[PDB]
Design a protein around this ligand. Structure first.
Ligand SMILES: [Mg+2]
Ligand SMILES: [Mg+2]
Ligand SMILES: [Mg+2]
Ligand SMILES: [Mg+2]
Ligand SMILES: [Mg+2]
Ligand SMILES: [Mg+2]
Ligand SMILES: [Mg+2]
Ligand SMILES: [Mg+2]
Ligand SMILES: [Mg+2]
Ligand SMILES: [Mg+2]
Ligand SMILES: [Mg+2]
Ligand SMILES: [Mg+2]
Ligand SMILES: [Mg+2]
Ligand SMILES: [Mg+2]
Ligand SMILES: [Mg+2]
Ligand SMILES: [Mg+2]
Ligand SMILES: [Mg+2]
Ligand SMILES: [Mg+2]
Ligand SMILES: [Mg+2]
Ligand SMILES: [Mg+2]
Ligand SMILES: [Mg+2]
Ligand SMILES: [Mg+2]
Ligand SMILES: [Mg+2]
Ligand SMILES: [Mg+2]
Ligand SMILES: [Mg+2]
Ligand SMILES: [Mg+2]
Ligand SMILES: [Mg+2]
Ligand SMILES: [Mg+2]
Ligand SMILES: [Mg+2]
Ligand SMILES: [Mg+2]
Ligand SMILES: [Mg+2]
Ligand SMILES: [Mg+2]
Ligand SMILES: [Mg+2]
Ligand SMILES: [Mg+2]
Ligand SMILES: [Mg+2]
Ligand SMILES: [Mg+2]
Ligand SMILES: [Mg+2]
Ligand SMILES: [Mg+2]
Ligand SMILES: [Mg+2]
Ligand SMILES: [Mg+2]
Ligand SMILES: [Mg+2]
Lengths: 339, 122, 46, 240, 393, 179
RNA sequence: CUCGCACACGCUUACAUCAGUAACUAAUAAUAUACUGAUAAUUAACAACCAAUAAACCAAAACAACACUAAAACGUUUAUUAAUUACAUUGUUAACCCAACACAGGAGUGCACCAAGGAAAGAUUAAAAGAAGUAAAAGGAACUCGGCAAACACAAACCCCGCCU
RNA sequence: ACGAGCUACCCAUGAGCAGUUUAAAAGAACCAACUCAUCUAUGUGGCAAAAUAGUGAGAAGACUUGUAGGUAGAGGUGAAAA
RNA sequence: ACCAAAGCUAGCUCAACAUACUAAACAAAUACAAAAAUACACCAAAAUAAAAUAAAACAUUCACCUAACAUUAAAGUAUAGGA
């Protein structure tokens, strides 16, 4: 049947609140509470990583020659896509010296992530079924730039029953006014791979922001705040879907709920600017019947957006931020607990 | 037996039939298939500062109307070119060859807003 | 088998067969338009 | 109304080109030829019927080509061979035993000594022995081949008189030509095409052949076994 | 000659000019005055139209000869999609190179050391195959256009995982779609390998030359095979506008200056749109060669000389079920003469990574005969793959 | 700046909201070009507001407060238009001397009617234009018959309109014979 | 008891909310998706619109390994130029269409066999004849133009004519 | 003059054919969807200007089917039934 | 007593005259699938009117029958016609 298709990368004004609503997600600024249980691992070379990253940046923005573009507008999609691919592939190995799990990891390159779920009720407005009661259905078809898939699950950021004073925003409207549109076709729950795959769990995702959503364009449209919102929304969608699907690969569903919190990480990027997100899925039951007495929430932590570099000029990378590298490093250093 | 009388509209046809309602095209289709807007084709509203000025949408009732004289090419010739022409013929400086000092324009193709082919909407 | 459903609507077929442009492309058609104009028809053509 | 013919493509290509059948209808849309239509869908391979065709006009001499592969053709009864030399490839009609990885000579040169004839060989008529088997026979020199292209057909060179060749067509009618005209030496491919058995009416339909009418016509005077003395010899030689 | 147009199609010849245009000293009267056709009046003739300001899109296409880079010498270009008629023969002749069956023994020793394997090899590779061929898509039976790049990248990752044991592999960077222009003159014929390959693995440090001097000098005595009727240029692009400059896809001062491996995927669904295995071998010969020639003229210069320091580049190629392995050693920058020392190429050809694959259980008389997965698996081909990835360390 | 779509809140629930007379043409001929340009926007904002109030009155099933304003405003704008137009059409008569701001020609179409054909702007000259070239301005010979019919039909109508008027006079003269 | 949800094509506001129905539409009512009035409404990401000119490519789709004959729809790359600059325009309701009707008929595609859709009886009585069904003692074609129809059967043989689908 | 939006035959371009049996996608076999229309009974101003109920025939083919085009009355089209 | 019944107007008809003969209305849009501002072309054309009918059939023939020359007579005369 007929469902709303939720797009993770959205032109709609405040899609963060709406998506929180659809997902039952609480948003908290700042990264999750630091797991101080960490061993004295960081023997990391910050200079070999500066070097390794700037190799990518410079290769893309300067060295590599592309068959000449008549636009000269230099599409940031066409520049940043290979930069990001190379960034992930590069850091993966370099930090795989420290974190052996990334050796057994699968790297996914622009492959679909699908999640389908039910939320709420509706009294059908029009038609011959007018007046009867139906659930609101949602589908997320997503295409992350890069994924890292593992054979064993990442650890929970907070316990399963962890509670927060802040409440999930309740929109007063139909989803239609977002805008959002109904359509119907096959409903798929897909993780980036089929069930038969031995790597069932997510590590982190890498989302390159599409061209429409550039900071410049938004600044032209008299949208200031939205610059942030677009990031949030993206995470809140993509991550959720990913987590959701992971959960349903483990047999959990609306009436089985979930035993152990499912977690995944994500990075969202305009080629210059980065943002880091952590998502813990607790409740898989958002259904009308299943959400009645249910206390739990899904939680999403996120970072304010922030520049990697400032103004590449002629094979020099002028401004540079190590904090960005350090957080990317945090995320890439996460591990399954060991028994 | 279909419908003869009701006007033909984009709502009526197949998918392939798209016929605008009469707004004007703001651009062209570019390389990627994506559409490109030309900043020049999009009408730029010229709006004056209204704040510091005194006039209102309505007029006082006891204020008089007037004898109705439609402006003619002649009256406009007399309020503008006639004083200057009489001034420079009385002084003998009148030159039947170049009238351009009085405001006459020989040809329209130089200037921004032309009158005869009518370059401007409003 | 059963008959009378002979008319199966298409807007494309309709406007190609009976449309204004079609009437104007041949001299015969133009004469059709002319006759209807004479008789004072509300709709000259589809 | 008016239809345009599919037969417009200017530049020669070895690549198969797409074509539109029209069952028997002329460009007006009426039926001209009865009983044609709806075969399998077919691509068309351009065939170069001028066997002597110097690549560049710079070097005129007799040249030699390699046979790369011999393929089935949907469009004609004979089997055709892909033939490459220099920088260029072309489809030519394949002679009976022509096989892949082969060598084939194309020559305009006559001589007093004639020639030992191989199969793929194209020579002017005057340059051949007087009993030879020929196919792909030009009419006027420089025209391109028309006669004797069908599968497994062969004519025979009969004689040479007055700087002119006289050949015997597969219908056993005699044809007079200048000896300056090119022919290929041998029998055309796929000799058993005669003995093919169409098993079922469906098979005929696959060939784009619609059935005969059901109307019964009484046979006329035209019918019977007419024994006619074989027609006079066609001469394409233009006398002064 | 049978000409290939058809009169019915060719744009109709202009209508025979009106008779009033044949009469000397007489001005015809035309409808050009009323700005539209009228019968009764003669057809006006107009000057070819010149819109005094030129418009970039709507102007007539500039004739080719007007270009600054135009040259009268026809140059034969080899780009990514050209098929060679005789693949490896031609490739060799254009490259002036001798062919050797196996891979270099350095690489084979690298391949047969039990230390150099991954954790569970058969397990992981059977998984990468199953994944690329089945699990990576939502659909029942994924097309080749998806699954070929997926399997080549899966194997690249299985090898990349070895950066833990031999930490010299971090000296490499991968690149996609670089302009490559290698111009060279061979036997009065001008050749240019010009275009983009799919994926190029670059290294910081060059590759050690893999042939002993005995092989080089035994290459000095080898006679190049020749295909008489077919010109060696067959299958290339005759081109009248080109640049002769040595170009590798990168500017000066590139941190990863030395080409290591080229990857050539054949992803097309239809047979006829893919390469014959042989033509693919040719493709990667010529492209490996260009890649090498570029460097060879960067580190030495345009002068044509035999090389005291041989350049080595590698190449791999794919149906996605079928692999073509290539190692090239460039010994010579003078290809004008036929008679000198020839470059060397080792080609391991037609290495099957697996026989066949089933994405659905094949069922006979209501029983399951063949289960889902690959039939037959050659750990050998992946072993060679690993070797070629491991050639640096 | 969204409130300019509504009257001052002091007016909202009131039946009668009074107002001045609309602008005459004459009072507008006295103002300069700049001031007309401004007055156009002052009138615009108010017309917008008034239309808003109109629809909102329909929505609430209530009569609109002092509907007449909407008339007045319109006339004013309309009047203003008439003035500015004058000063252009006078002006161009001086400069060029064409009475029509749009280039156009008297033509005879397929149907033989004598039509005024307005021109259109194109980037390419007329003989290079496919679409324009396939219009026909001229009639074929058969059309001549239809033309005649048109005339005759017209003539009839006029003919029996005339006769009607004549008749109406006679009737009245015998009904009201005050002569 | 089970023809359901969507899209194309086609219909054009018949859809929504509030109010009204003495009469008008429903083949009756109750009341209302269909009559009356007033007031509203479908928002682009889906869809339509959305480059030419040269040049290399002989090598089917059939899980494609490789083949079969009837010889097969579907593009890459290289070169030359392609206005470069947020937001363009248009389809988005429905219980719907073709059959004069709110017609047991005709209607393409994708998914479903229920989780979705629906109601055979206005109320009685229990005559004949008619329709549709279930069962039947003994018999088993005696019926009849003919084993037509029906059956707890669902088998075998032989001719005539046409070879066969 | 107007008609091929029904139907006859074509042209382009799409779409369908599950299970079972077979070395086989063989104008093979069983049997759905689908396409037809054998025989009977209803119905006969009918639900219907050709239907309903049962029963039947074909069902990878000379198969069904969507969309857009063509052929026009001294004509077209026709596996001839005028 | 229901159903009903009665008006005298709307306009028309036929001529006269008459200037002369495609009315009115055009802001935009209108010959893309008319009412859709904007891109390199094509464009256009003619061949005897026929038959129904009369001749009691039908075969040569059959007034008028979309071509300005009216009126009074000559005259239904000269002529033409399966005469
Ligand atoms: Mg009608
Ligand atoms: Mg439409
Ligand atoms: Mg539609
Ligand atoms: Mg846009
Ligand atoms: Mg009808
Ligand atoms: Mg044929
Ligand atoms: Mg054949
Ligand atoms: Mg026959
Ligand atoms: Mg017969
Ligand atoms: Mg209707
Ligand atoms: Mg309603
Ligand atoms: Mg009623
Ligand atoms: Mg809808
Ligand atoms: Mg009843
Ligand atoms: Mg009874
Ligand atoms: Mg009974
Ligand atoms: Mg019974
Ligand atoms: Mg009994
Ligand atoms: Mg008996
Ligand atoms: Mg009896
Ligand atoms: Mg029976
Ligand atoms: Mg029986
Ligand atoms: Mg029996
Ligand atoms: Mg039979
Ligand atoms: Mg049709
Ligand atoms: Mg089947
Ligand atoms: Mg069968
Ligand atoms: Mg039936
Ligand atoms: Mg029964
Ligand atoms: Mg049945
Ligand atoms: Mg059967
Ligand atoms: Mg059978
Ligand atoms: Mg048609
Ligand atoms: Mg007759
Ligand atoms: Mg006929
Ligand atoms: Mg008969
Ligand atoms: Mg008679
Ligand atoms: Mg009589
Ligand atoms: Mg008679
Ligand atoms: Mg007559
Ligand atoms: Mg006589």
């Amino acid at each position: 049947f007929m469902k709303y298709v939720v797009y993770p990368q959205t032109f709609a004004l405040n899609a963060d609140n709406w998506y929180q609503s659809f997902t039952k997600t609480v948003f908290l600024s700042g990264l999750p509470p630091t797991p101080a249980k960490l061993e004295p691992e960081p023997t990391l070379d910050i200079t070999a990583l500066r070097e390794a990253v700037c190799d990518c940046l410079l290769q893309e923005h300067f060295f590599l020659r592309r068959k000449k573009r008549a636009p000269v507008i230099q599409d940031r999609e066409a520049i940043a896509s290979p930069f990001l691919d190379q960034l992930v592939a590069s850091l993966t190995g370099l930090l795989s010296v420290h974190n052996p799990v990334l050796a057994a990891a699968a790297l996914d390159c622009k492959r679909p992530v699908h999640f389908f779920w039910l939320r709420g009720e509706e009294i059908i407005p029009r038609g011959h079924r007018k007046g009867r009661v139906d659930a609101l259905r949602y589908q997320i078809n997503d295409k992350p730039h890069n994924q890292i898939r593992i054979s064993r699950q990442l650890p929970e950021f907070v316990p399963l029953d962890y509670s927060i004073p802040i409440e999930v925003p309740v929109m007063s409207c139909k989803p239609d006014k977002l805008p959002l549109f109904k359509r119907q076709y096959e409903n798929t729950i897909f993780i980036g791979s089929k069930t038969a795959d031995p790597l069932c769990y997510g590590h982190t995702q890498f989302h390159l922001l599409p061209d429409k959503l550039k900071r410049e364009k938004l600044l032209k449209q008299n949208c200031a705040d939205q610059i942030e919102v677009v990031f949030r929304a993206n995470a809140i969608a993509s991550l959720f879907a990913w987590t959701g699907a992971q959960a349903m690969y483990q047999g959990f569903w609306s009436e089985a709920d979930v035993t152990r919190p499912f977690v995944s990480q994500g990075v969202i990027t305009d080629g210059k600017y980065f943002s880091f997100f952590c998502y813990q899925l607790n409740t898989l039951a958002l259904t009308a019947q299943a959400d009645q007495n249910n206390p739990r929430k899904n939680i999403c932590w996120g970072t304010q957006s922030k520049p990697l570099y400032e103004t590449i000029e002629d094979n020099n990378v002028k401004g540079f931020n190590d904090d960005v590298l350090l957080q990317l490093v945090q995320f890439l250093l996460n591990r399954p607990k060991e028994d | 037996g279909a419908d003869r009388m009701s006007k033909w509209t984009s709502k009526r046809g197949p998918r392939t039939f798209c016929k605008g309602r009469g707004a004007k095209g703001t651009g062209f289709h570019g390389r990627d298939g994506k559409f490109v807007q030309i900043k020049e084709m999009i009408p730029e509203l010229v709006v004056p500062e209204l704040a510091g000025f005194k006039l209102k949408p309505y007029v006082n009732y006891r204020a008089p109307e007037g004898t109705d004289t439609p402006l003619t090419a002649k009256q406009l010739f007399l309020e503008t070119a006639a004083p200057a022409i009489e001034k420079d013929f009385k002084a003998g400086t009148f030159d039947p060859e170049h009238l351009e000092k009085y405001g006459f324009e020989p040809t329209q193709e130089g200037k921004l807003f032309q009158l005869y082919p009518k370059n401007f909407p409003r | 088998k059963a008959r009378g459903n002979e008319y199966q609507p298409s807007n494309i077929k309709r406007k190609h067969k009976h449309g204004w442009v079609r009437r104007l492309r041949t001299p015969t058609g133009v004469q059709v338009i002319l006759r209807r104009m004479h008789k004072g028809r509300k709709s000259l053509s589809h | 109304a008016t239809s345009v013919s599919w037969k417009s493509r200017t530049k020669y290509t070895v690549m198969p080109v797409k074509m539109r059948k029209s069952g028997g209808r002329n460009h007006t849309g009426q039926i001209q030829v009865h009983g044609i239509g709806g075969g399998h869908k077919q691509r068309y391979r351009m065939i170069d019927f001028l066997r002597f065709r110097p690549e560049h006009e710079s070097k005129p001499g007799p040249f030699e080509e390699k046979v790369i592969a011999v393929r089935y053709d949907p469009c004609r009864s004979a089997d055709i061979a892909l033939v490459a030399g220099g920088n260029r490839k072309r489809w030519i009609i394949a002679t009976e035993n022509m096989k892949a990885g082969d060598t084939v000579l194309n020559s305009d040169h006559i001589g007093r000594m004639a020639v030992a004839a191989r199969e793929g060989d194209a020579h002017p008529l005057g340059a051949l022995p007087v009993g030879t088997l020929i196919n792909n026979v030009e009419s006027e020199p420089g025209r391109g081949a028309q006669y004797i292209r069908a599968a497994g057909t062969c004519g025979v060179l009969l004689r040479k008189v007055n700087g002119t060749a006289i050949i015997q067509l597969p219908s056993k009618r005699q044809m007079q030509v200048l000896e300056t005209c090119i022919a290929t030496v041998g029998r055309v491919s796929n000799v058993d095409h005669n003995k093919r058995v169409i098993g079922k009416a469906g098979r005929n339909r696959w060939l784009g052949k619609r059935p005969n009418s059901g109307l019964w016509q009484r046979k006329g005077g035209w019918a019977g076994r007419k024994i006619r003395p074989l027609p006079p010899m066609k001469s394409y030689v233009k006398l002064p | 000659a049978y000409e290939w147009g058809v009169r019915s199609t060719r744009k109709p010849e202009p209508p025979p000019l009106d008779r009033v245009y044949e009469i000397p000293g007489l001005e015809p009267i035309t409808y050009a005055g009323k700005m539209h056709f009228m019968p009764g009046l003669a057809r006006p003739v107009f000057p070819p139209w010149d819109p005094g300001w030129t418009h970039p899109k709507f102007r007539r296409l500039p004739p080719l000869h007007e270009h600054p880079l135009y040259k009268d010498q026809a140059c034969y270009v080899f780009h990514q999609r050209c098929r060679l008629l005789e693949g490896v023969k031609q490739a060799l002749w254009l490259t002036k190179t001798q062919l050797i069956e196996g891979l270099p023994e350095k690489v084979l020793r690298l391949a047969d050391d039990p230390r150099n394997h991954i954790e569970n090899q058969d397990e992981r590779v059977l998984n990468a195959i199953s994944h690329a061929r089945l699990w990576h898509s939502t659909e029942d039976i994924p097309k080749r256009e998806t699954y070929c790049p997926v399997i080549v990248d899966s194997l690249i990752q299985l090898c990349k995982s070895q950066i833990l044991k031999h930490p010299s592999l971090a000296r490499r960077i991968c690149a996609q779609n670089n302009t490559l222009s290698a111009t060279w003159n061979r036997e009065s014929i001008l050749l240019q390998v010009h275009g983009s390959s799919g994926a190029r693995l670059n290294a910081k440090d060059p590759l050690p030359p893999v042939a002993s001097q005995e092989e080089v000098e035994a290459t000095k005595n080898h006679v190049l095979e020749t295909f008489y009727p077919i010109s060696p240029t067959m299958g290339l692009q005759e081109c009248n506008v080109y640049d002769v400059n040595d170009d590798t896809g990168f500017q000066e001062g590139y941190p990863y200056p030395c080409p290591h491996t080229l990857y050539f995927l054949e992803s097309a669904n239809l047979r006829p749109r893919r390469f014959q295995p042989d033509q693919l071998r040719a493709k990667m010969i010529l492209f490996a060669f260009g890649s090498a020639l570029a460097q060879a003229r960067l580190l030495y210069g345009n002068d044509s000389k035999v090389l005291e320091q041989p350049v080595v580049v590698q190449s791999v190629g794919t149906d996605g079920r079928l692999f073509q392995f290539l190692v090239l050693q460039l010994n010579t920058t003078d290809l004008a003469s036929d008679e000198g020392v020839k470059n060397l190429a080792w080609v391991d050809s037609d290495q099957l990574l697996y026989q066949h694959f089933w994405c659905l259980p094949v069922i006979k008389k209501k029983v399951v005969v063949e289960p889902v997965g690959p039939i037959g698996f050659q750990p050998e081909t992946f072993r060679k793959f690993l070797a070629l990835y491991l050639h640096g360390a | 700046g969204l409130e300019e779509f509504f009257d001052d809140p002091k007016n909202w629930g009131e039946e009668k909201v009074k107002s001045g007379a609309s602008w005459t043409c004459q009072q507008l001929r006295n103002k300069s070009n700049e001031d007309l340009h401004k007055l156009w926007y002052v009138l615009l904002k108010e017309r917008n507001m008034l239309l808003t109030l109109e629809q909102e009155a329909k929505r609430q099933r209530l009569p609109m407060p002092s509907p007449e304003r909407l008339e007045k405003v319109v006339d004013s704008m309309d009047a203003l238009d008439k003035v500015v137009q004058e000063r252009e059409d006078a002006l161009r008569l001086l400069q060029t001397g064409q009475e029509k701001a749009r280039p156009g020609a008297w033509r005879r179409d397929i149907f033989g009617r004598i039509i005024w054909h307005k021109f259109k702007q194109w980037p390419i000259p007329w003989y290079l234009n496919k679409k324009y070239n396939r219009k026909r301005f001229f009639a074929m010979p058969y059309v001549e018959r239809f033309v005649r019919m048109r005339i005759e039909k017209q003539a009839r109508i006029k003919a029996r309109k005339r006769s009607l008027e004549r008749k109406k006079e006679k009737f009245l003269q015998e009904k009201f014979p005050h002569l």
